[PDB]
């Protein structure tokens, strides 16, 4: 995504205040709780039986953190998203076989999480710009599949 300078400001303005530890973790857990088939990919992580188990699972949090740092690196290369996510695309396509459809799901869980943390400050306009990022991250993660 080429974002307009207004959108870029809305996004980067809010990113600056995200506890990248908490949030990476909550978005991943919620992914495994809400779309539970996603648990199949994370079997070596421990008990993923109950919502609580998933939200408190240490390995889930740690992986949350990588996911988000990956997102953070994304925010730095906004106008080369496809090349910035080249390597993660191959890994997810050819090594792990995660259908491209789940990336838009994680984007959506991610957006819900940011709404949950920032309530009133997550205004419709700010949301419009995050939908554009997440959509762009998702497309960039899908390059090698098509």
């Amino acid at each position: 995504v080429h974002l307009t300078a207004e959108e870029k400001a809305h996004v980067s303005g809010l990113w600056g205040k995200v506890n990248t530890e908490e949030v990476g973790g909550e978005a991943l857990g919620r992914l495994l709780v809400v779309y539970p088939w996603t648990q199949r990919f994370f079997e070596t992580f421990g008990d993923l039986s109950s919502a609580n188990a998933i939200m408190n699972n240490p390995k889930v949090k740690a992986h949350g953190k990588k996911v988000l740092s990956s997102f953070s690196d994304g925010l730095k290369n906004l106008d080369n998203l496809k090349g910035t996510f080249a390597a993660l695309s191959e890994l997810h396509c050819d090594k792990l076989h995660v259908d491209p459809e789940n990336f838009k799901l994680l984007g959506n869980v991610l957006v819900c999480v940011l709404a949950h943390h920032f309530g009133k400050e997550f205004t419709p306009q700010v949301q419009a710009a995050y939908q554009k990022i997440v959509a762009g991250v998702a497309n960039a993660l899908a390059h090698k599949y098509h």
């Binding site: 709780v33 809400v34 957006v111 819900c112 709404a115 309530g119 949301q127 419009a128």
Partner: protein, 141 residues
């Protein structure tokens, strides 16, 4: 397919939303028009201003039907047949549009009610909004 925990979750959370639904509906609508512009091609005949009074009125009508549905979780086809005739036969809404509004509703709830929007509630609510969507986009009359 909604599980019982799903239902006791869906009813629980709607208790809290409750008298505020009217504005959550409008916020949700506003959120969607704004984040997915194509959705506005469905309301050519509406004021889509930020303060819009019709959008508010329509949010209230949306939220009522959602209240209606929480009361009828064991027979949604029965309860929403009229809304289904409207959305499926008459207006012919593309189902992707439901995914967008359903997502914007969740985001709205998350915003106003973080303490009630636990992972599990999130989960039941998403199943709920998508069952509702299947009924509204099915032709079964």
């Amino acid at each position: 397919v909604l599980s019982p925990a799903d239902k006791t979750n869906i009813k629980a959370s709607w208790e809290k939303i409750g008298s505020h639904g009217g504005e959550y509906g409008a916020e949700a609508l506003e959120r969607t028009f704004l984040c997915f512009p194509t959705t506005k091609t469905y309301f050519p005949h509406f004021d889509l201003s930020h303060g819009s009074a019709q959008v508010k009125a329509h949010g209230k009508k949306v939220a009522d039907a959602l209240t209606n549905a929480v009361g009828h979780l064991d027979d949604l086809p029965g309860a929403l047949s009229a809304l289904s005739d409207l959305h499926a036969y008459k207006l012919r809404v593309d189902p992707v549009n439901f995914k967008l509004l359903s997502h914007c509703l969740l985001v709205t709830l998350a915003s106003h009610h973080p303490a009630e929007f636990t992972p599990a509630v999130h989960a039941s609510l998403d199943k709920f909004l998508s069952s509702v969507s299947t009924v509204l986009t099915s032709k079964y009359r």
